[PDB]
RNA sequence: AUACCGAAGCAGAAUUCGGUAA
RNA sequence: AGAACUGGCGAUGCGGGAUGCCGAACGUAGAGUUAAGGUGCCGGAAUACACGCUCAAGACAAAAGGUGUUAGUUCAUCUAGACAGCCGGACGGUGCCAUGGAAGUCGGAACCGCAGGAGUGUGUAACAACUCACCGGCCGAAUGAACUA
């Protein structure tokens, strides 16, 4: 007493990822450990469509640890414990057959626009005009920009904390306000001035088990 | 103050055996006869009690986390219940269970069946928090609001409840 | 809906006229409610429609036919919106 | 469950020092001092290293555990107020009757009403009409309870007189909450 | 008087600044009002409340069963 | 017996409903 | 609403239940132990011990509800990260009738490519934006649903 179209995946999904990782450990010719800065479904699908010989396997980090071995004394193959320990942050684990020279170039040459992240300052000192606000931001060319919707002001005054106010159905501010609220403000305006460039660490081989640790973005 | 007795019967064979807790041998025999009907089809005149002997605790000087399985006949049928009790002897452990049942479920000696009692020698085996809390390392706690039985009708010092 | 409401009122009057016309006496009153509920509850849909139309008809403007009036017609939002303003 | 023992910990910044006797709070810090009586809760305090005070309850229950946790919450609120300091902001708007707020807090010409509304200033709370910002008032104070009570009284004593709740937008609302630091 | 006069004014000036927070808090209080009322209302009030609560429980169970059906197929 | 609260597409006037109360 | 029957009065004291079933059936007296019923005062007797309960009770209504309080049963999660809570992903083909706008979210009729409904709500003429259910960084072990009392 006195307590607060899909179903829970359960242990079956975790075992599925475990089995997939165990099979891909030797199915593919080469392996990489990734530390992608952010997760973005359009970007994570562009990475897949950009090549056919390489595939990105994603799952629970601890589930990958079980498949690769949480201890070196129980690793199924040489340097598998190091491979399991290397992965961190976003659970990005890439499988590829192309040589290291071809694979490494994509990470450096590939970059896409993305929003900011918590604990990071805004990439630019964007400021809303000191007047009637607009959907795109106002400071951007006003010819294309359009006045904001009337019903969204309460969210701005609370979620974003900006001193917006509705006047005759249009939101207006009396001062030129500047930009997790730091990322949220940019996200709302669509100012994706930041960029995402998936970074990788140690290139891995399924037979030599080479640990070619690096930090190319 | 209950007492543990071992009672066996064979209807004058298989020599059915069970443990009975009662204040005296007379009550133990009656409880054994009553349980005989539930276990199988036997009557008092069928045979005789082969042997009845009181069982004393092997060493009433050790604290044991007794695990007890007890079945009781509630107002709406009988249900199987299991509990763990921290005590020093089986005789005291069963009495504490009886008192707890009478306090809450209001089940008494008439409608309580004792199935099995066994000690627990390993931690984390007791799944009841009220006993699990006492299985930690040597702990300390106070006894606030202590009182004293003032025999004298009058007091002049305004007694304090400090301990 | 109006016909249904009139029929409900007529049935209520019929029920009242029917009654106008310990253990045993206890059951006398039950039938009145038991049949009034049957008569009334079935009118929820007409009542729902009546309530729906009430809100829309309670805010009609003053479209007076007698007073001199002017109207504007054409393709929507060809500058017409600001003309009346 | 009837927990035999239960206790919590309070974080004490180096800027503030505290001493508790007979369930009496004595929070002292850069922004002044605060006190509160918690005798009716019957909780016990215990120092450990002059930087963390244990609040413990023995042989308590859910009813007593609630009070024990509320004690920690109140202590944390008092520490935050004495250190950072709270700043309650309130904005007021008027559809067609300016609210000539004036000083003690006074409100005039609300919805054209001739009656004058006012709320006395409480202890530990200051009033500072917002500068440059139009029709805004900024409140501050070390005691969260007093500032919040003053804001609630100001928002409640000035309300529409049982008219349409949507057409009449005039009133006073808590626009933003923050800290002095 | 217009067809959407109240809606027009709401869109032109927005809802009450504290309507959302007050509404959320009002629903939060109503969450406990369900238990608060059932332990005090007497006579006809309690008689109606018990029946309404039973109907809501039955309706909630039927809704849950229907939701489960939509997942099977 | 009169009024005090919350709700209604209650713009105002005006009206109805759940509680207090005779 | 009559009824075939077995214990008890009529002729029945006394103690107890404020007063009208339990105990016990009767000479006048002294001494000791009890039945029923009691041990805060009226009221002669322990504001006795021990286990828990209860905030308004306590010395025909039980059909049902309580985010009132305290215990056990079934299933589920298991440091491959229990539950609460923050941030992100929440995509693709894409959809037809209403044609006036309807693109998950006013109303017709029910896929899947790779942790994600052709969609639980908010909301816009509709996109827009947030979202829960589903997962991920996340936290460090009890926990969610119904029952027995």
PDB file of N, CA and C (backbone and C1' of nucleotides) in Angstrom, chain D residues 1-2 61-62, chain G residues 53 69-71:
ATOM      1  N   UNK D   1       7.847  -3.539   8.066  1.00  0.00           N
ATOM      2  CA  UNK D   1       9.238  -4.045   8.251  1.00  0.00           C
ATOM      3  C   UNK D   1       9.737  -3.726   9.656  1.00  0.00           C
ATOM      4  N   UNK D   2       9.371  -2.546  10.159  1.00  0.00           N
ATOM      5  CA  UNK D   2       9.779  -2.088  11.485  1.00  0.00           C
ATOM      6  C   UNK D   2      11.308  -2.076  11.602  1.00  0.00           C
ATOM      7  N   UNK D  61       8.859   3.854  12.313  1.00  0.00           N
ATOM      8  CA  UNK D  61       8.044   3.294  11.256  1.00  0.00           C
ATOM      9  C   UNK D  61       7.915   4.270  10.104  1.00  0.00           C
ATOM     10  N   UNK D  62       7.066   3.902   9.141  1.00  0.00           N
ATOM     11  CA  UNK D  62       6.841   4.766   7.987  1.00  0.00           C
ATOM     12  C   UNK D  62       6.453   6.173   8.423  1.00  0.00           C
TER      13      UNK D  62
ATOM     14  P     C G  53       2.807  -3.479  15.669  1.00  0.00           P
ATOM     15  O5'   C G  53       1.215  -3.544  15.628  1.00  0.00           O
ATOM     16  C5'   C G  53       0.527  -4.097  14.515  1.00  0.00           C
ATOM     17  C4'   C G  53      -0.916  -4.396  14.844  1.00  0.00           C
ATOM     18  C3'   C G  53      -1.819  -3.190  15.056  1.00  0.00           C
ATOM     19  O3'   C G  53      -2.283  -2.637  13.838  1.00  0.00           O
ATOM     20  C1'   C G  53      -2.197  -4.800  16.764  1.00  0.00           C
ATOM     21  P     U G  69      -0.809   3.777   5.460  1.00  0.00           P
ATOM     22  O5'   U G  69      -0.533   2.749   6.646  1.00  0.00           O
ATOM     23  C5'   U G  69      -0.141   3.207   7.932  1.00  0.00           C
ATOM     24  C4'   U G  69      -0.356   2.151   8.986  1.00  0.00           C
ATOM     25  C3'   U G  69       0.364   0.828   8.763  1.00  0.00           C
ATOM     26  O3'   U G  69       1.721   0.853   9.170  1.00  0.00           O
ATOM     27  C1'   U G  69      -1.892   0.405   9.301  1.00  0.00           C
ATOM     28  P     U G  70       2.812  -0.049   8.408  1.00  0.00           P
ATOM     29  O5'   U G  70       2.519  -1.532   8.914  1.00  0.00           O
ATOM     30  C5'   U G  70       2.946  -1.963  10.199  1.00  0.00           C
ATOM     31  C4'   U G  70       2.700  -3.437  10.405  1.00  0.00           C
ATOM     32  C3'   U G  70       3.278  -4.370   9.349  1.00  0.00           C
ATOM     33  O3'   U G  70       4.653  -4.644   9.548  1.00  0.00           O
ATOM     34  C1'   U G  70       1.036  -4.978   9.807  1.00  0.00           C
ATOM     35  P     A G  71       5.425  -5.660   8.570  1.00  0.00           P
ATOM     36  O5'   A G  71       4.829  -7.089   8.942  1.00  0.00           O
ATOM     37  C5'   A G  71       5.182  -8.241   8.189  1.00  0.00           C
ATOM     38  C4'   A G  71       4.279  -9.409   8.495  1.00  0.00           C
ATOM     39  C3'   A G  71       4.248 -10.510   7.444  1.00  0.00           C
ATOM     40  O3'   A G  71       5.327 -11.421   7.582  1.00  0.00           O
ATOM     41  C1'   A G  71       2.033  -9.948   8.075  1.00  0.00           C
TER      42        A G  71
END
